[PDB]
Amino acid sequence: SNITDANLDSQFNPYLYNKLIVHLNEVSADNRKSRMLVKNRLKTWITDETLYINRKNMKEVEIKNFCNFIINSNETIPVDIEDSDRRFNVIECNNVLKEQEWWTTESYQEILNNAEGFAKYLAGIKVDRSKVNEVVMSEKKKAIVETTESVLKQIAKALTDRDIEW
Amino acid sequence: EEKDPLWLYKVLLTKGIEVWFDIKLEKYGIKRNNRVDYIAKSSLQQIVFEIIGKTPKNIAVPTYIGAYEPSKPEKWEEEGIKYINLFKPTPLMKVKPVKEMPEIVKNLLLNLFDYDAKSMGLFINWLAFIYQYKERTGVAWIFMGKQGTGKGLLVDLLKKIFEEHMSSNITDANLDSQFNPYLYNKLIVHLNEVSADNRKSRMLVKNRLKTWITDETLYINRKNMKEVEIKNFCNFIINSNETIPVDIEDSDRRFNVIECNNVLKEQEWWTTESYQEILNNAEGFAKYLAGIKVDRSKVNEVVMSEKKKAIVETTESVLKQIAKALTDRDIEWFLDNGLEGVVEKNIVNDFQWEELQEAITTGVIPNKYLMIIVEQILGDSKTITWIKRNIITPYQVGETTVVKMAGKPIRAIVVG
Amino acid sequence: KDPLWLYKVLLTKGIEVWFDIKLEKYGIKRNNRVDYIAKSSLQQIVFEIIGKTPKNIAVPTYIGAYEPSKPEKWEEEGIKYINLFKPTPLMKVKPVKEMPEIVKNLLLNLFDYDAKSMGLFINWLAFIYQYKERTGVAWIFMGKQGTGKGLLVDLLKKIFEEHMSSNITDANLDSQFNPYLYNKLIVHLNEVSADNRKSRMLVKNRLKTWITDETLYINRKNMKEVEIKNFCNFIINSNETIPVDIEDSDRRFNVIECNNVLKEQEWWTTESYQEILNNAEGFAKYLAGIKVDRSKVNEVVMSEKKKAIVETTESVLKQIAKALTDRDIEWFLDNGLEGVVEKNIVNDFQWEELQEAITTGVIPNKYLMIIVEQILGDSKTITWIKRNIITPYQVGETTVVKMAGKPIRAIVVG
Ligand SMILES: [Hg+2]
Ligand SMILES: [Hg+2]
Ligand SMILES: [Hg+2]
């Protein structure tokens, strides 16, 4: 829980050792150079079959990677995303919980007291293994792609596609 | 005192465990099922106690030097120095050849190579040489283009064949370490990007990557172990999604560059199970590689593909391109790069325009036209000093001197 | 009774073991490999050979020193030394008067059939082969790829073996460790740094001292940092336009540029490469028979490519400062100063007085500013010119001079 750029800049890798879910609270700062310095390392954490784990006063070890990543962010562009990207689904909500019909003072704790109920629900899902690795080009992901990619690539592809409308 | 200094070695061999002391690492080697670990004396005493029930104060095992040599026996002697081999074939390298590839694996390589049979075959030949001869080739293959073309799948599938002899998914992070375990006793090294997507990062790594591909030996430094020199058996496969993954010189001998934009999901033959079918045909692909008739002349062959040409011309200096255009009196290169704009801006009249072109073609360029030419190509005015220091002198285009044209003495650069 | 009983017994089996007080490790030498190991590691070797682990190690105490001129062991002040230099086979070889024909074709191609510079390199190599000392002069082979630079490296590598470091690059240099310099007669660099202004300058001073320093500080992993005498000689291969920065007065570098591709030659065949490497002993015999001219070992030549590197590398401000100092009007005209006339910054009379200021070494401030602006391409103030050209290079003094009637401010060169 709540791994951030600070943990990433450490020389150690505990938060990845023997994990099924890793949650990042921001991957880096919201500037062009921070997103690009971390872009390739996050790319491989999601898909590499193994990871090199290095912990304090322990031998550096290679292990199979079981990690799955959930990234929370309050920034406008949390990560760099390529057009052909296969790894990221992007969900943007602007529905503040406090501002909802059903939200109460006890609501937060009721949500956490229904972990077992939610766990029972997931245990009964008929998992479609075809859709597990499906990613969607949402309108916010499309916005991140066109913000992130090089303008020179956008010009080059407009010429290539003879895209006068572009 | 002891009658047989090899008694413990012998007893462990009966039970399928080979133990020695490696003078070069000052650690104890232990081999079981062709996996070898190097452990301290205290850890070896613990292993021994579990097996024979006694902890011997003295370790009755031979002293060998560990050497990774695929061509040599399990143990051998050179001069008076006894060696033990650290290379052990994996299951899928000891496999009966077949003449044809699994159909789905061939659809993947055909997708990667965009149905170009020539370059696919050259890569198969390169792979087949590594599988059968187990030597360093001095040639690396770069697979680039958009995501989802199957680059990682091919890596995963070779990784099931080679196993421990291959390093998977090495990144800039591993390279920025002071350690290089990913190079120790490896036949294939796979890199996911070599550096950041900018000019200076590519250049800082250019010579490091160049020597990893061709050095006969490497200095290996691993955590908590002596720094050791070893023979280099690495061959490099580089995956990248960037436009220019590495710097490449024109005369390059090391890089083959393959670009696919065929996304697997967008293909007629792709199914949901296809991904898992590809990985379950590792043995099928290995049997295919085992039967390839390797053409050893072509193993170190590199081709100048069009994407390779694009990287080279993006990589080299604009100043060197101008210098070679002067040297070759290549008026066509200058007009290809827009030198005719000089007339459209009336910097030069049509008579002067004739002398400017002819100055280039004859290799005798008056200073006034030199500056005009350079300003038009580079977009800002350069002094003669700047043109001499950055184009004429470093590339030895010619000499700056006084020449006589009709009567007048004129300052010019004479190409030669 | 005999504190050397184990030493003697290990010699029987072809193993020489000593304790190195300077490294506080145990040396063990077999067949020109020397390893330095811990006491527990030597006890393990000893147990396998003699069947007992002795609590006390009956070995001599020596200091390990790499000295090619000295015997296997020697004494100085009663301090016993052991030699870490041990000749390779191809250094123990019978001289001959001529080199193998195909090896001479390789060197002829590298040196573009220039017998003068080729011979100076052979003499340089022969001195290293025969005397095994540091020369203080490095050789840079540059030009197109495929001229045979690596082939010459590979062939000396067979000759020198362990006393040579092959294919050291900027990556090794940025390491905190220094193995490639420990106990070496030849070190070969494949590029010293990237081909940019800042990379060449950051490494310029470290390469300067490696060639000429009498000692080096060697630091290896899990070993004490040690000072040793430096026997290194450097061969630098490069495909870059400017491989290193070179000063005008430089004394260390010879620069050889060949553009003769081996594949494109009359005599090159498919077997040629391996024939070249199979004539190591022939080339070694040739060097063994050279009458080395010790006067020329440290001679460097100002080749046209080295001259090109010098003028590319050095500061333009130094070039201007020395042109003023030498009143070198021709230098200024070669660098386009007459553009001042064609742009009407100066009329025909002033143009004469400006040139006259340069040859006379008395330059009015007004003409100083014009000259500097035309050469550098941007307008400079008098203060900037004094702080960045006149003062740091001691071109001259700013003073009032009388020119025609008027008292005028000028820089007097001297
Ligand atoms: Hg993980
Ligand atoms: Hg390697
Ligand atoms: Hg040295």
Author numbering:
A (entry chain B): 470 to 635
B (entry chain A): 303 to 718
C (entry chain B): 305 to 718
Sentences from the paper on this structure:
Two NrS-1 CTR structures were determined, one in A-form and another in B-form. The B-form crystals were grown in P213 space group; per asymmetric unit contains two NrS-1 CTR monomers. Via symmetry operation, B-form structure can also assemble into hexameric rings, which is virtually identical to the A-form structure. Owing to its higher resolution (2.4 Å), the B-form NrS-1 CTR structure was utilized in the following structural analysis. The ring-shaped NrS-1 CTR structure can be divided into three regions: Head, Body and Tail. The interior channel of the helicase ring is highly positive in charge. Although we failed to obtain the crystal of NrS-1 CTR complexed with nucleotides, we observed one well-defined phosphate group bound with the Walker A motif of the B-form structure. The phosphate group forms four strong H-bonds: one with the side chain NZ atom of Lys453 and the other three with the main chain N-atoms of Gly450, Lys453 and Gly454, respectively; the average distance is 2.8 Å. As showed by structural superposition, the phosphate group observed in the B-form NrS-1 CTR structure corresponds to the β-phosphate group of ADP in the E1 protein structure. Docking the ATP molecule from PAN ATPase into NrS-1 CTR structure suggested that Arg556 may interact with the γ-phosphate group of the bound nucleotides.
NrS-1 polymerase is a multidomain enzyme and is one key component of the phage replisome. The N-terminal Prim/Pol and HBD domains are responsible for DNA polymerization and de novo primer synthesis activities of NrS-1 polymerase. Here, we report two crystal structures, showing that NrS-1 CTR adopts one unique hexameric ring-shaped conformation. Although the central helicase domain of NrS-1 CTR shares structural similarity with the superfamily III helicases, the folds of the Head and Tail domains are completely novel.
